[PDB]
Design a protein around this motif. Sequence first.
Motif, PDB file in Angstrom:
ATOM      1  N   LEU A  46      86.877  47.379  36.201  1.00 57.33           N
ATOM      2  CA  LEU A  46      85.767  48.320  36.245  1.00 57.33           C
ATOM      3  C   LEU A  46      84.454  47.595  36.531  1.00 57.33           C
ATOM      4  CD1 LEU A  46      84.786  51.259  35.797  1.00 57.33           C
ATOM      5  CD2 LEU A  46      84.356  50.647  33.422  1.00 57.33           C
ATOM      6  N   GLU A  47      84.220  46.470  35.857  1.00 54.71           N
ATOM      7  CA  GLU A  47      83.018  45.673  36.091  1.00 54.71           C
ATOM      8  C   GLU A  47      82.889  45.256  37.552  1.00 54.71           C
ATOM      9  OE1 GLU A  47      82.326  43.581  32.489  1.00 54.71           O
ATOM     10  OE2 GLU A  47      81.312  41.942  33.572  1.00 54.71           O
ATOM     11  N   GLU A  48      83.961  44.712  38.123  1.00 54.52           N
ATOM     12  CA  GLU A  48      83.922  44.288  39.516  1.00 54.52           C
ATOM     13  C   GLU A  48      83.702  45.476  40.448  1.00 54.52           C
ATOM     14  OE1 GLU A  48      87.692  42.375  39.455  1.00 54.52           O
ATOM     15  OE2 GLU A  48      86.890  40.353  39.177  1.00 54.52           O
ATOM     16  N   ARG A  49      84.409  46.583  40.211  1.00 57.78           N
ATOM     17  CA  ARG A  49      84.252  47.740  41.091  1.00 57.78           C
ATOM     18  C   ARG A  49      82.836  48.294  41.005  1.00 57.78           C
ATOM     19  NH1 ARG A  49      87.470  51.709  39.089  1.00 57.78           N
ATOM     20  NH2 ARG A  49      88.448  50.637  37.316  1.00 57.78           N
ATOM     21  N   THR A  50      82.251  48.259  39.811  1.00 62.24           N
ATOM     22  CA  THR A  50      80.923  48.808  39.616  1.00 62.24           C
ATOM     23  C   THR A  50      79.849  47.901  40.224  1.00 62.24           C
ATOM     24  OG1 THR A  50      81.729  49.912  37.623  1.00 62.24           O
ATOM     25  CG2 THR A  50      79.315  49.650  37.880  1.00 62.24           C
ATOM     26  N   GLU A  51      79.942  46.593  39.997  1.00 54.27           N
ATOM     27  CA  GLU A  51      78.956  45.682  40.568  1.00 54.27           C
ATOM     28  C   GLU A  51      78.913  45.779  42.090  1.00 54.27           C
ATOM     29  OE1 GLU A  51      79.318  41.880  38.852  1.00 54.27           O
ATOM     30  OE2 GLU A  51      77.484  41.048  39.752  1.00 54.27           O
ATOM     31  N   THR A  52      80.072  45.897  42.732  1.00 58.43           N
ATOM     32  CA  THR A  52      80.090  46.029  44.186  1.00 58.43           C
ATOM     33  C   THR A  52      79.341  47.282  44.640  1.00 58.43           C
ATOM     34  OG1 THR A  52      82.178  44.853  44.172  1.00 58.43           O
ATOM     35  CG2 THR A  52      81.609  46.008  46.183  1.00 58.43           C
ATOM     36  N   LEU A  53      79.608  48.423  43.991  1.00 54.27           N
ATOM     37  CA  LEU A  53      78.967  49.681  44.371  1.00 54.27           C
ATOM     38  C   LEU A  53      77.452  49.608  44.264  1.00 54.27           C
ATOM     39  CD1 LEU A  53      81.395  52.314  42.963  1.00 54.27           C
ATOM     40  CD2 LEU A  53      80.353  52.306  45.246  1.00 54.27           C
ATOM     41  N   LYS A  54      76.946  48.816  43.322  1.00 53.32           N
ATOM     42  CA  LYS A  54      75.506  48.649  43.183  1.00 53.32           C
ATOM     43  C   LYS A  54      74.857  48.141  44.476  1.00 53.32           C
ATOM     44  CE  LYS A  54      74.571  44.908  41.251  1.00 53.32           C
ATOM     45  NZ  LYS A  54      73.988  43.610  40.793  1.00 53.32           N
ATOM     46  N   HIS A  55      75.583  47.386  45.302  1.00 54.93           N
ATOM     47  CA  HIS A  55      74.980  46.864  46.527  1.00 54.93           C
ATOM     48  C   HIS A  55      74.992  47.848  47.690  1.00 54.93           C
ATOM     49  CE1 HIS A  55      74.536  42.838  44.880  1.00 54.93           C
ATOM     50  NE2 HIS A  55      75.714  43.032  44.315  1.00 54.93           N
ATOM     51  N   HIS A 101      82.186  40.403  50.837  1.00 51.46           N
ATOM     52  CA  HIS A 101      82.495  40.490  49.415  1.00 51.46           C
ATOM     53  C   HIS A 101      81.214  40.363  48.576  1.00 51.46           C
ATOM     54  CE1 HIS A 101      82.214  36.046  49.206  1.00 51.46           C
ATOM     55  NE2 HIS A 101      82.918  36.048  50.325  1.00 51.46           N
ATOM     56  N   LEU A 102      81.395  40.467  47.252  1.00 52.55           N
ATOM     57  CA  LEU A 102      80.285  40.430  46.311  1.00 52.55           C
ATOM     58  C   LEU A 102      79.446  39.165  46.452  1.00 52.55           C
ATOM     59  CD1 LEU A 102      79.214  42.322  44.010  1.00 52.55           C
ATOM     60  CD2 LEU A 102      80.432  40.854  42.427  1.00 52.55           C
ATOM     61  N   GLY A 103      80.070  38.048  46.842  1.00 53.52           N
ATOM     62  CA  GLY A 103      79.314  36.822  47.057  1.00 53.52           C
ATOM     63  C   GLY A 103      78.298  36.949  48.177  1.00 53.52           C
ATOM     64  N   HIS A 104      78.705  37.549  49.305  1.00 51.10           N
ATOM     65  CA  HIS A 104      77.758  37.848  50.379  1.00 51.10           C
ATOM     66  C   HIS A 104      76.653  38.761  49.876  1.00 51.10           C
ATOM     67  CE1 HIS A 104      81.397  36.888  52.918  1.00 51.10           C
ATOM     68  NE2 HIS A 104      80.470  36.245  53.608  1.00 51.10           N
ATOM     69  N   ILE A 132      73.942  64.953  43.862  1.00 45.99           N
ATOM     70  CA  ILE A 132      75.322  64.886  44.336  1.00 45.99           C
ATOM     71  C   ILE A 132      76.098  63.938  43.431  1.00 45.99           C
ATOM     72  CG2 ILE A 132      76.847  64.266  46.250  1.00 45.99           C
ATOM     73  CD1 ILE A 132      74.917  66.792  46.542  1.00 45.99           C
ATOM     74  N   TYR A 133      77.325  64.324  43.078  1.00 46.51           N
ATOM     75  CA  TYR A 133      78.211  63.497  42.273  1.00 46.51           C
ATOM     76  C   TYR A 133      79.475  63.181  43.061  1.00 46.51           C
ATOM     77  CZ  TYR A 133      81.232  61.797  38.538  1.00 46.51           C
ATOM     78  OH  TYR A 133      82.057  61.020  37.765  1.00 46.51           O
ATOM     79  N   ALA A 134      79.800  61.900  43.176  1.00 47.74           N
ATOM     80  CA  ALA A 134      80.999  61.461  43.892  1.00 47.74           C
ATOM     81  C   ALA A 134      81.768  60.480  43.016  1.00 47.74           C
ATOM     82  CB  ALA A 134      80.631  60.815  45.224  1.00 47.74           C
ATOM     83  N   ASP A 135      82.946  60.862  42.554  1.00 47.90           N
ATOM     84  CA  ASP A 135      83.694  59.945  41.706  1.00 47.90           C
ATOM     85  C   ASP A 135      84.866  59.366  42.483  1.00 47.90           C
ATOM     86  OD1 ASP A 135      85.178  62.318  41.782  1.00 47.90           O
ATOM     87  OD2 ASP A 135      85.531  62.433  39.626  1.00 47.90           O
ATOM     88  N   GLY A 136      85.410  58.279  41.962  1.00 49.22           N
ATOM     89  CA  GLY A 136      86.531  57.636  42.614  1.00 49.22           C
ATOM     90  C   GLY A 136      86.872  56.351  41.899  1.00 49.22           C
ATOM     91  N   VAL A 137      87.908  55.690  42.412  1.00 53.34           N
ATOM     92  CA  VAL A 137      88.271  54.382  41.879  1.00 53.34           C
ATOM     93  C   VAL A 137      87.419  53.294  42.514  1.00 53.34           C
ATOM     94  CG1 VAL A 137      90.170  52.763  41.542  1.00 53.34           C
ATOM     95  CG2 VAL A 137      90.603  55.244  41.471  1.00 53.34           C
ATOM     96  N   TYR A 138      87.128  53.433  43.801  1.00 55.55           N
ATOM     97  CA  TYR A 138      86.386  52.425  44.557  1.00 55.55           C
ATOM     98  C   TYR A 138      86.961  51.018  44.347  1.00 55.55           C
ATOM     99  CZ  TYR A 138      83.308  56.444  44.826  1.00 55.55           C
ATOM    100  OH  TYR A 138      82.817  57.705  45.024  1.00 55.55           O
ATOM    101  N   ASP A 139      88.288  50.909  44.442  1.00 56.59           N
ATOM    102  CA  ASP A 139      88.940  49.604  44.381  1.00 56.59           C
ATOM    103  C   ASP A 139      88.840  48.917  45.739  1.00 56.59           C
ATOM    104  OD1 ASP A 139      90.315  47.533  43.121  1.00 56.59           O
ATOM    105  OD2 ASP A 139      92.283  48.366  43.588  1.00 56.59           O
ATOM    106  N   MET A 140      88.499  47.628  45.730  1.00 55.85           N
ATOM    107  CA  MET A 140      88.303  46.843  46.953  1.00 55.85           C
ATOM    108  C   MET A 140      87.564  47.658  48.010  1.00 55.85           C
ATOM    109  SD  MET A 140      91.981  44.922  47.123  1.00 55.85           S
ATOM    110  CE  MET A 140      93.026  46.390  47.181  1.00 55.85           C
ATOM    111  N   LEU A 141      86.308  47.979  47.688  1.00 50.91           N
ATOM    112  CA  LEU A 141      85.481  48.835  48.534  1.00 50.91           C
ATOM    113  C   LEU A 141      85.531  48.402  50.000  1.00 50.91           C
ATOM    114  CD1 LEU A 141      83.404  51.136  47.536  1.00 50.91           C
ATOM    115  CD2 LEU A 141      81.667  49.483  48.226  1.00 50.91           C
ATOM    116  N   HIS A 142      85.880  49.337  50.881  1.00 57.39           N
ATOM    117  CA  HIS A 142      85.914  49.108  52.321  1.00 57.39           C
ATOM    118  C   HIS A 142      85.030  50.131  53.051  1.00 57.39           C
ATOM    119  CE1 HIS A 142      88.832  52.461  52.662  1.00 57.39           C
ATOM    120  NE2 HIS A 142      89.422  51.924  51.609  1.00 57.39           N
TER     121      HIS A 142
END
Lengths: 131, 131
Positions: free
Chosen positions: A56-65, B16-19, A6-16
Amino acid sequence: SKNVVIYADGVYDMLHLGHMKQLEQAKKLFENTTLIVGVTSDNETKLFKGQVVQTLEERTETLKHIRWVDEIISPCPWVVTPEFLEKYKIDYVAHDDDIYAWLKRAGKFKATQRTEGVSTTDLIVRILKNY
Amino acid sequence: SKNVVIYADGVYDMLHLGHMKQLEQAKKLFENTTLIVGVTSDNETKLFKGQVVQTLEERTETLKHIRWVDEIISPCPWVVTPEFLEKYKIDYVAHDDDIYAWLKRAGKFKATQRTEGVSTTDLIVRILKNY
């Protein structure tokens, strides 16, 4: 059963929670999946969509979790092409719902839904009704 | 190697990413772990710590989407007790760093660290330097 990519693209800004529920939905489309997430570049997002608060770095690091995320393509192309599907062996594109007519025609589009009111900007509108 | 049960409690308001980095750290303390996360109640947080913007339900649902989280206790007690450790078979308490002296004395405390500047409130301070 065989693994479905499955492929899901997006901006994922301030992931909620709305993003997270959408990713969970894509991940659970089939019993055995690999969820690939594409994160759009800063330049194209700014140019095509609007201001982005996280890089992009911040949005990507968050998605990793996020539990549902198996693989990340960062940055990802702004437009999905047939070649992109073949390159990464994508079976379905999962996205909120045209520009996806060609995917739906091929049976390769799976609609996922948003959650209203949960977004990050709405949570500030909250604390701003403490006054 | 045998499974190690880790307990990490907190408010987890506007995660957030810190958590997320802190939870990853707790999860990866040993090779084989179960990470239990405790989410503090609205009343006690308000009373002991300060205003919370997200309800217990909202804070808990968000944590469910995090890769490192194996189990959630929601609401969790405000203070960890020896009985609590025995009830859930907790091997170590993972927390930022006293009130944990008794844990450190027993060898049951593992310090995890914060990440500055990544927090949700700081991201609004951002968009608020667009003017």
